[PDB]
Amino acid sequence: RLKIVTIHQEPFVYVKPTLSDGTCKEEFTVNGDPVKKVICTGPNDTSPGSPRHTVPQCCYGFCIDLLIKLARTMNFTYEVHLVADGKFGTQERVNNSNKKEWNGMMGELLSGQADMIVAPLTINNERAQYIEFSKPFKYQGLTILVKKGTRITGINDPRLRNPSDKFIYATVKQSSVDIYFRRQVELSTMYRHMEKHNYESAAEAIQAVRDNKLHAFIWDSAVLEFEASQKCDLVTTGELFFRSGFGIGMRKDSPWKQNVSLSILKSHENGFMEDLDKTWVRYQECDS
Ligand SMILES: N[C@H](CNC(=O)C1=[SH]CC(Cc2ccccc2)=C1)C(=O)O
Numbered sequence: 001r002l003k004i005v006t007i008h009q010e011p012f013v014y015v016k017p018t019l020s021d022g023t024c025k026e027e028f029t030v031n032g033d034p035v036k037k038v039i040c041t042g043p044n045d046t047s048p049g050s051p052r053h054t055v056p057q058c059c060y061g062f063c064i065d066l067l068i069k070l071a072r073t074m075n076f077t078y079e080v081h082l083v084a085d086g087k088f089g090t091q092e093r094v095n096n097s098n099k100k101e102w103n104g105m106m107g108e109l110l111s112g113q114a115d116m117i118v119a120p121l122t123i124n125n126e127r128a129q130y131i132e133f134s135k136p137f138k139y140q141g142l143t144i145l146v147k148k149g150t151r152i153t154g155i156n157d158p159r160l161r162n163p164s165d166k167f168i169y170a171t172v173k174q175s176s177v178d179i180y181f182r183r184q185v186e187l188s189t190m191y192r193h194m195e196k197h198n199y200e201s202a203a204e205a206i207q208a209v210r211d212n213k214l215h216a217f218i219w220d221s222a223v224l225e226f227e228a229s230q231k232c233d234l235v236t237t238g239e240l241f242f243r244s245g246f247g248i249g250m251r252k253d254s255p256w257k258q259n260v261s262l263s264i265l266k267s268h269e270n271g272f273m274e275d276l277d278k279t280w281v282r283y284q285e286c287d288s
Contacts, residue, residue: 154238
């Protein structure tokens with residue numbers, strides 16, 4: 001049985017409690033089809049002070065539908081869990097030494113706590129040094145989320161490039177967003193500003209934008225465009241940048257890679273990804 005690791009990230013992965021009986025609530029799409037749900041174990045509370053308890057939860061969304069298809073197509077069984085530290089994955093020092101390790105899903109995949117990462121996981125060369133990716137299952141980029149009415153053009157807007165305290169922007173901790181900001185000369189000063197204010201999760205950053213505590217949130221367009229389309233008070237602004245894909249993650253020299261990529265190819269070829277888009281990404285007007 002493959003150990004699949006994933007992360008809470010709407011609309012790709014929804015995470016909800018079980019009912020009192022341990023079952024997942026019966027739900028239907030707008031088209032009337034049952035929402036496919038899998039059990040996923042993971043931490044139930046992320047609040048500072050609150051104890052961690054790893055409990056069965058209910059998972060569903062674009063990525064779970066993709067998983068279900070993959071497992072059928074390639075004839076594997078699986079069990080899903082949520083990444084224990086809540087992170088996508090960057091490199092960090094081990095015990096403040098010069099040796100480095102990955103945190104997040106990257107870290108679990110490398111340690112064997114997972115066999116496959118099935119998530120909105122950005123393909124990039126830093127991570128590709130350590131793991132294999134499928135071909136992209138979705139093409140996307142970064143964009144910026146703001147409150148409706150905020151006057152920002154994009155990543156080269158002087159309010160970002162020449163920041164005062166009057167305008168706070170941020171991304172998510174231990175995602176690939178920081179290092180690619182660091183590695184750019186034109187964006188080094190933004191990395192300096194942001195590492196001070198970054199959020200533990202996308203959900204918390206989004207909420208901070210709604211609550212006027214964060215003026216701009218830099219994050220995946222596949223996510224922010226959905227969020228802004230679901231919430232009438234939030235918008236995205238500027239051109240996509242750092243265009244890149246989401247891929248399935250596997251250990252180097254995994255025997256699964258070729259067949260995973262072939263599955264993803266078929267899904268781009270035959271309308272399946274577009275069907276998923278129509279189920280999870282664009283289907284109704286804002287209401288949340
Ligand atoms: N999906 C999340 C967050 N998204 C990111 O970290 C991103 S999206 C684009 C980007 C930079 C880049 C530049 C060139 C080539 C590839 C990526 C970083 C993750 O996996 O941590």
